[PDB]
Design a protein around this ligand. Structure first.
Ligand SMILES: [Mg+2]
Ligand SMILES: [Mg+2]
Ligand SMILES: [Mg+2]
Ligand SMILES: [Zn+2]
Lengths: 125, 136, 37, 128
RNA sequence: UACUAAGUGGAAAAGGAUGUGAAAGUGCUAAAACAGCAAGGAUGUUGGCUUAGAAGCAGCCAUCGUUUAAAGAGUGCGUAA
């Protein structure tokens, strides 16, 4: 209901407030076996892949007093890859896997109170 | 074939099925029931067809009750016989179903099987049937 | 095509339509075409 | 991609492979080379069947619930779920879990613990 | 002032139907509804008896659990399986 939605938006906003790194991905053509493989290869509590609602992510972003991420969350399929402490190794790991995949897109994310572009994601690894 | 073991009188006057519902009007043993919407004479043969249908479409733990019983008999003069020379001999037993009498009831199995079971029982009977539930 | 006084879907794919003021049942399986509903 | 059932000690036959173009005679030595540590046990193999021709294969553990029978000291489990015959403690369950951790896609070891209970419930063995 | 689209009116039953109008409730929805489209749609494993064989889809012993957004001892087709 509305109360559950309010609780959900509050806790994800808190999680993204206390976090340090974020990157957005799509869910096009990768297997669930592969999904479990990514979970085990990360194996770090700081690194977390999650399916978030597009609407809930924008509203939690609004509550996070950040800006510029709107272009990422518009008419697109969104993943969240939150990283605590070190985020470069998580980005390196996910980049190696998408190279191991068949096809994949990659949308701009958010880290260190700054935003990046697609090519900036290519070099952030 | 439900049949009374003995009767005091072999040839009674027929019992009318026109009127409202005297007894057997509300589900009181199960909780789903097959109500009638048209009074008619239905014989023990139709009961056995309907009862066998319910039992075949029942499960391993469902339980059923048959309310109506063919108390009254009916006669039929032999073919090619001119009128007179007394009443005919009893041929078949019929239960008197009035508009509003619950004939069959079922319980102790999920709702869909019970709805289906009552449907197949009512397609075996001439009266226009309807599903009803038991008051809490 | 099967002509019956009563027509009902046989599978979950059977779909009831009303064509030329007659109700029929069409489906992927041609054994299940019904008419005269 | 083909999940084929091949004996560890006898894997040279199998005509199905020849339909895809796999070099059967060269790869028989690869099939037999890395299964000598588990001789006698039946071991299926997953094959990344493709036109690359460099078919990478992965072995696989014998199927579960036979070590449950071995640990329960009974040949065949009960024919009724309600009827309880075999009893298995946590130590035998954990040995089975660490053995079968290789084929399982679970992240943690307690997840593997309660897999043994789950298949033991299917076998009817009480978890004590 | 409404209704019918059947020449019903201007003859008929058991039964069947997204014909249409009225009413009374209940679920979701611009924190996105339903349909469709684009993706995934899992692991132990193909569980085990059982069956020549079944191991996602023969009867069973039942009708498992994790990862996870989701996934069913599967939805069918289908494969000796
Ligand atoms: Mg007329
Ligand atoms: Mg209708
Ligand atoms: Mg209406
Ligand atoms: Zn059909």
């Amino acid at each position: 209901a509305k109360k559950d939605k309010a609780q959900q938006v509050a806790d994800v906003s808190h999680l993204l407030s206390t976090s340090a790194g974020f990157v957005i991905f799509d869910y096009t053509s990768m297997s669930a076996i592969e999904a479990t493989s990514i979970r085990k290869k990360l194996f770090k509590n700081g690194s977390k892949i999650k399916v978030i609602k597009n609407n809930i992510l924008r509203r939690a972003l609004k509550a996070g007093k950040f800006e510029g991420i709107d272009e990422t969350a518009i008419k697109g399929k969104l993943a969240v890859a939150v990283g605590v402490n070190e985020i470069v190794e998580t980005l390196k790991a996910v980049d190696g896997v998408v190279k191991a995949k068949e096809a994949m897109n990659f949308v701009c994310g958010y880290f260190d109170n700054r935003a990046f572009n697609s090519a900036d994601l290519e070099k952030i690894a | 074939m439900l049949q009374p073991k003995r009767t005091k009188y072999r040839k009674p006057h027929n019992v009318s099925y026109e009127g409202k519902a005297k007894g057997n009007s509300y589900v009181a043993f199960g909780e789903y029931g097959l109500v009638a919407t048209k009074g008619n004479w239905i014989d023990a043969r139709a009961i056995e067809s309907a009862r066998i249908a319910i039992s075949k479409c029942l499960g391993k733990t469902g339980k059923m009750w048959i309310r109506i019983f063919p108390h009254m008999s009916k006669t039929k003069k032999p073919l090619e016989v001119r009128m007179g020379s007394g009443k005919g001999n009893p041929e078949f037993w019929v239960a008197v179903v009035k508009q509003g009498t619950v004939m069959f009831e079922v319980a102790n199995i999920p709702e869909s099987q019970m709805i289906k079971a009552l449907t197949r029982a009512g397609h075996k009977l001439p009266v226009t049937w309807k599903i009803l539930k038991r008051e809490e | 095509m099967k002509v019956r006084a009563s027509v009902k879907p046989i599978c979950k794919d059977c779909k009831i339509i009303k064509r030329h003021q007659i109700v029929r049942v069409i489906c992927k399986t041609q054994k299940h075409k019904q008419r005269q509903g | 991609i083909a999940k084929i059932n091949l004996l560890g000690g006898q894997a040279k036959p199998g005509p199905a492979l020849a339909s895809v173009g796999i070099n059967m005679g060269e790869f028989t030595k690869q099939f037999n080379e890395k299964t000598k540590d588990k001789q006698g046990e039946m071991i299926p193999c997953v094959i990344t069947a493709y036109n690359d021709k460099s078919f990478d294969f992965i072995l696989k553990t014998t199927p579960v619930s036979i070590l449950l029978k071995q640990a329960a000291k009974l040949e065949k489990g009960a024919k009724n779920a309600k009827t309880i015959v075999g009893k298995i403690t946590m130590a035998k369950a954990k040995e089975i879990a660490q053995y079968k951790l290789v084929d399982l896609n679970a992240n943690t070891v307690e997840a593997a613990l309660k897999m043994v209970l789950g298949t033991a419930k299917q076998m009817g063995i009480e978890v004590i």
